[PDB]
Scaffold this active site. Structure first.
Site, PDB file in Angstrom:
ATOM      1  N   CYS C   1       0.575  -1.304  -0.093  1.00 33.32           N
ATOM      2  CA  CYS C   1       0.040  -0.089   0.011  1.00 33.32           C
ATOM      3  C   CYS C   1       0.882   1.466   0.061  1.00 33.32           C
ATOM      4  O   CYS C   1      -0.068   2.425  -0.342  1.00 33.32           O
ATOM      5  CB  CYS C   1      -1.094   0.094   1.045  1.00 33.32           C
ATOM      6  SG  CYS C   1      -2.287  -1.274   0.840  1.00 33.32           S
ATOM      7  N   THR C   2       2.062   1.695   0.294  1.00 31.62           N
ATOM      8  CA  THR C   2       2.835   2.966   0.033  1.00 31.62           C
ATOM      9  C   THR C   2       4.144   2.804  -0.326  1.00 31.62           C
ATOM     10  O   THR C   2       4.733   2.234   0.471  1.00 31.62           O
ATOM     11  CB  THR C   2       2.586   3.818   1.327  1.00 31.62           C
ATOM     12  OG1 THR C   2       1.105   4.202   1.437  1.00 31.62           O
ATOM     13  CG2 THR C   2       3.353   5.156   0.936  1.00 31.62           C
ATOM     14  N   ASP C  20       0.065  -2.445   3.477  1.00 33.23           N
ATOM     15  CA  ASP C  20      -1.045  -2.346   4.390  1.00 33.23           C
ATOM     16  C   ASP C  20      -1.982  -3.333   3.997  1.00 33.23           C
ATOM     17  O   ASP C  20      -2.342  -3.634   2.700  1.00 33.23           O
ATOM     18  CB  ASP C  20      -1.844  -0.819   3.860  1.00 33.23           C
ATOM     19  CG  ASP C  20      -0.744   0.366   4.132  1.00 33.23           C
ATOM     20  OD1 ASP C  20       0.375  -0.097   4.870  1.00 33.23           O
ATOM     21  OD2 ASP C  20      -0.910   1.260   3.800  1.00 33.23           O
ATOM     22  N   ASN C 165      -1.618   2.594  -3.236  1.00 30.58           N
ATOM     23  CA  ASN C 165      -2.443   1.529  -3.750  1.00 30.58           C
ATOM     24  C   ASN C 165      -3.870   1.965  -3.364  1.00 30.58           C
ATOM     25  O   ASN C 165      -4.727   1.064  -2.875  1.00 30.58           O
ATOM     26  CB  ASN C 165      -2.199  -0.009  -3.120  1.00 30.58           C
ATOM     27  CG  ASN C 165      -2.551   0.168  -1.486  1.00 30.58           C
ATOM     28  OD1 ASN C 165      -2.289   0.818  -0.669  1.00 30.58           O
ATOM     29  ND2 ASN C 165      -4.094  -0.210  -1.159  1.00 30.58           N
TER      30      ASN C 165
END
Lengths: 317, 317, 317, 317
Positions: C1-2, C20, C165
Site C-alpha cells: 500500500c505505500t 497495508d 495502492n
C-alpha cells in the site's frame, strides 16, 4: 455574528461587522440626537439617563439597538446567537432591558475605557435572540461584554481586534490559536465556522495597508468583512451556530461615517454624522426606512432620505 | 479572475464573476443594439461582421469588452492573468483583435453550442493583459476557450461550472481534485489562491437552493461571488497570479439582468435588458459612465442614467 | 500500500515501501539464486523462463512474491487493494499467474527500462488480494504497471517517485496536485488517506539530504516510510481503501541491502545480498522463517538465519 | 519531544514517547535496583534519598536520567527543548540537579498522585538542554511539571494524555483546540510542528482499540508514536523547536516492559522488569551499552545483554 477593527496610521480606525441570522431582522437605521431622556424598560426600577452623545444606529425589529456609532466615535455591535447565561432579576436593583443595552452605551460614553470603568460598578443588571456586546473607539480600543454563569464578564484591550458570536470569547481565542503559527498567504480555514471566520478576519485585518487613504482603507475593510460573511441560503440545520449574513456595517471612526450594506437587496450607502443635527435644541429623531430585507434602495450619502419619526419604544417590562 | 454558474429550477440560471487586477481597469458599461457593423481591428484582413444580438457589456479601458451578456442570454467573461501562448499572426488569414473577442461572440451567437460549433471551424486568428474566454447560456451550458501551444483549446459542457484565471483549465480541474474527497462543511481552503477560490465556488454553487425565487437566488449568488473575491490591497508581490478584486458582475440569464458592483466605491446597481431598445431601427449606442474606480454612484435599475455616446474603437492594428 | 524512491548523490538510491492489509499476510523472506527454471502456473500454456538474476523477496503466504530486489538493483513492490480490471484469459496465449508477476520481473530484468520494453510487447496475459506492480532501479528510474479496462497500462519515468495502492495512478497524480502549491513545512495533510500519504511521501522524499552517507540516508528513509504507514488497529470500515500497515521494507540499491520491519512484532533486520551465494553452480534456495505476524525475531544482518528450503509453488491453475 | 498515554481495558495502560534532538544524545539504558543511596549533586545542601523502587531508565549522556519506568509502574519522560525559566539557586535550600530530577521521582514514588502531593510542597529547588517532566502511572494518571517565571507549575489529571516539548503546556492545549472541531478521519495536520504532533497523538490515542491483547495494543502504540516522530535529517534551522526523532520508548505499565527503538540504527528490543533482580541484597547496577547512535544491536528481551557496571555520576555542582 462577525466583527473586526482595523487600525491604520494617523487615527484611521475602522470597525466592520456582519449580522448573521436565520431570518429577517427587520432592521431600519435611526438617528438620535443628544439630550434624549430614556428609560431601561425594566419595570419600576428601570435605569434612567439622558443621552450625552448623538448616535446613528441599526435597529433590531425597531424595538432594539443592535449596531451603531456615536458622534464621539464609539461603536457598538450587539452580536446574535451567543452562549449566554444571564442573571436573575429580583426587581430591587436598577434594571436595563437588553434591547437598549447598546443604546445606553452609545448614549452615555465617548470611549471604550469610559464605558468599561462604569460597567464595572454594578449598575449593569440586564433584563432578558441571545446577545453579547462588542465595543470599539476612535483610539482603536476594544472590549467585549458577556454573561457567563449569570455574571458580567469583560475583556478589554486593543489587541482584541476580532470577535465572533460563538463560542464564548475566552474559547474563541483558543480556537484561533493554532493558526497563529501558519502564514495566512499559505493556508487559511475557509468554512463559515466562527473559528474559521475569526482566523481569516484576524489575518486580513493585520494585512491591510496602514497608509492614510480613507477610500482605500474603506475598500479593503469592506472586502474583508464580505470575505468573512456567511453566504446566503447555504447553511443547513446540521450547524446551528452559523447563519446567513443578512447585512454588513462599516464604521469610519475618524470621519464619522456609518456604511450599511444588504445581502438580500443590492443596496449600499452610508450616513455622514458630520451633516446631521444632533443638538438638543433643534435635532430631530429620524429614521431611514429600509423595509423588509432592505428592499428600499439608497446610495451614496443617504442623509436626505432620513425622515423625522417618533422614536420607537424599546422592548421590555 | 473568478467565474461560476449556478443552475436552479425552471431555467433560473445565473453567471457570476469577479475581476481581479493590480490596478484600475477603467471600466464603464455600454449598450450596443443590433445591426452594428464591426471590424476586428487586425489590419487589412480583419474579420468583419454585423451584430445579430444586442448586448450590455463591461469595458476594459473603453477599448475592449471584458464582460457582458446579450439579449439571448449568452454571457461572456474575459478573465485576466492567464497562461496563454497565442499564435503568431501572418497577415494572410482573417484576424480578430483580442480586445473584441468577447464582443464578437456576444454579437453573433445565442448559445454556447452555437458559439463552440463556429469557433471549432477556425473563422479567425486571435491577435495581440493576457486573456481567456468563459461562456455560459440561459440553458446552463458552459465553455472555456484558451490558447495553449499557439492552439485554440475549448472545453465545453454544463459540468464546467467553475473557472479561474490560473492556471490552465485542465490544471484547474487537477488542483480541485484533492478537495472532492473532503466535505465542504468540514474544511475548505480559505486563501485567495485560484485553486482555493475554485474549490469554494464549486462547493457553494452546488449548495445554493434550486427553488424558484429570483431575489433569493440573486442574494445567494452575490454572497458566493463575494466570498471568492480577493480582498483589496492585501496581496503582496510574492504571489504574482493573485490580484485584488476590482468589481463583480452577476448575470441573470432568465430575466436578462446585468448586475454590477464596485470594490473601490460603494456602488451597486443593475441594467435591465428588457427595457432597452436594442433594435437597429431606433436603438442607440449608450454608455453608463462609472468613472475612475467607479466613483459615479448608481443604484437599483440604472437604465435611465445611460447616455447616447459614440461607440469606442477596439484596440489593435 | 505505500511506496517511494529517494535519489541521493553518487547513485545512492533507495526504495521504501509499506504493506497495508486487513490481516496477516503470512510473509516470509526467500533467497533465490540464478538459473532457476520456472513456470507461470497458468495451465498448459504457462510462460516458462530461467532466472538470470538472483533475488531476495518477501512472500505473500509463501505462495506469491509481493516484494523484493535482485542482485542487479531492480526492486519490485506489488501493492494490494488496487482498482484493477484484469483481462479474461482464453488459454491460447502464454499465461502468467499474478502471484509470480513480481518474481518474473525480478528474475529476468536488470533495469526498469529493460522491463518496460519487454512488457510493452505483450509477452503474456496475467491470470487471476487485488494487485498492481511498482518498479525501481539503481539508476533511480521508476514505473508502475496497472490493469484498467482489461488493459495493461504502464507509467514510466524517474519523476514517478511516489505510488500508493489507493486510486489508479493517474488519479493519484490528480489528488496530489493541490499540494504542489503548498509548502510542506507549513501544511501537510496528516490522515491515512492514500492521497495524504502520497503528498507526505513526495514532500519528505525530496527534502531528504542528498549527501553521500548511507547510514544517514537509511535513517531518513525509514523514518519517512514510518511516517507514511497507517497506524495499527485504527481504521474503520467507513474507509475501505485504507488498512493497517503490517510491515515495511527498504531497499538499498547501491549496496544491495534488503531491510525488513514488522509492525506486529518488534522485529527489524536486513539481508545483505553481497554475502549471499546467488550462483547457479553452488547457490541454494533459502528461507528466513518469520512466522505468523513475524514473531520470530532477528536483528542486524540476518543472513546466518537463512535456511536451505525447497522453493514454494506459486499459486494459480 | 512527544509523549502520550493509551488506556485500554483491565489496566492495560501504555506510555509512549519520542525523543527529538539535533544531535546524538549518547543514550544507554540502565538498571538500578532498590536501596541505592543518592545525592542531588547540588553542592553541600544537595537533597539526599535512598531509592524505594528499582527502575530501568534511558540516560542522557550517561550523566542524567531522561526516560524510564519503575517496578511499581510509574513512568517518567523528560522532554527536551522546552520554554523554561528556572528559579535562581541560593545554596541555602535543599537542591536537586535537573539531571537527576526524573531519577528522584522514579526512585521515590509509585504513583503520579504520590509524586504530585510531595512536589506541591516544595521539597527542593531544581538546579540548572532545557527540560520539563512528564509522568504517568499504571492507573492511567498523568502529570506534567514545568518551570514558568521561576515557579514550579504542575498540571495533574488523567485527561492530560498527550504532551509535547513546545510550547508551554497551557499553550499546547490552546493550539490543539481548533482541531477538536474537526474529525480526525477527515483532516489532521500532518507537519512536524509540535501542535500537529499533539493533535495526531490525541486523535490516535483515543482511537486505539481498548481490547485486552497486549501484542495488539503494543503494535498500535508503536505505530502511533512512530506516526508522531519527526523524520530524520529533514528539519531546517528555520524551525528551531523541531528536531529529528533520535529514539522512541514504549512503557507497558501492566507487564512492566520497557521497549526501546532507534531511528539511526535498525535496533528494537525491550527490557522485562519481572526478570530483573531489583533487591538491595543481591541486585546489581547494570547497563545496556547501545553505543553512539545505538550501533550495538539487540533484539527481543535483551536482559541477558545487560552488564554489571558502576552507576554513573549525575551532572551538577
Amino acid at each position: 455574528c462577525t466583527r473586526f477593527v482595523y487600525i491604520g496610521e494617523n487615527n484611521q480606525v475602522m470597525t466592520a461587522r456582519s449580522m448573521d441570522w436565520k431570518t429577517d431582522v427587520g432592521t431600519n437605521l435611526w438617528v438620535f440626537p443628544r439630550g434624549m431622556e430614556r428609560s431601561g424598560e425594566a419595570g419600576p426600577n428601570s435605569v434612567k439617563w439622558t443621552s450625552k452623545y448623538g448616535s446613528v444606529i441599526a435597529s433590531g425589529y425597531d424595538v432594539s439597538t443592535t449596531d451603531g456609532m456615536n458622534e464621539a466615535g464609539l461603536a457598538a455591535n450587539v452580536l446574535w446567537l451567543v452562549e449566554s447565561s444571564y442573571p436573575d432579576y429580583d426587581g430591587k436593583s436598577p434594571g436595563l432591558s437588553i434591547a437598549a443595552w447598546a443604546q445606553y452605551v452609545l448614549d452615555n460614553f465617548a470611549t471604550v475605557e469610559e464605558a468599561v470603568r462604569v460597567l464595572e460598578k454594578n449598575p449593569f443588571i440586564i433584563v432578558t435572540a441571545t446577545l453579547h456586546l462588542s465595543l470599539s473607539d476612535a483610539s482603536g480600543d476594544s472590549a467585549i461584554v458577556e454573561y457567563i454563569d449569570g455574571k458580567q464578564v469583560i475583556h478589554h484591550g486593543r489587541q482584541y481586534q476580532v470577535m465572533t458570536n460563538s463560542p464564548t470569547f475566552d474559547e474563541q481565542l483558543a480556537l484561533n490559536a493554532y493558526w497563529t503559527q501558519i502564514g495566512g498567504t499559505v493556508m487559511l480555514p475557509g468554512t463559515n465556522r466562527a473559528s474559521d471566520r475569526f482566523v481569516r478576519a484576524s489575518f486580513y485585518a493585520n494585512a491591510i495597508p496602514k497608509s492614510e487613504n480613507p477610500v482605500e482603507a474603506i475598500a479593503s475593510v469592506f472586502s474583508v468583512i464580505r470575505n468573512v460573511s456567511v453566504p446566503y441560503g447555504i447553511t443547513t440545520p446540521d450547524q446551528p451556530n452559523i447563519s446567513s449574513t443578512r447585512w454588513r456595517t462599516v464604521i469610519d471612526h475618524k470621519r464619522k461615517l456609518y456604511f450599511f450594506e444588504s445581502a438580500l437587496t443590492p443596496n449600499v450607502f452610508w450616513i455622514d454624522m458630520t451633516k446631521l443635527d444632533l443638538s438638543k435644541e433643534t435635532g430631530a429623531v429620524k429614521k431611514l426606512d429600509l423595509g423588509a430585507n432592505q428592499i428600499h434602495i439608497y446610495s451614496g450619502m443617504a442623509n436626505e432620505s432620513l425622515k423625522d419619526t417618533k422614536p420607537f419604544k424599546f422592548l421590555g417590562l
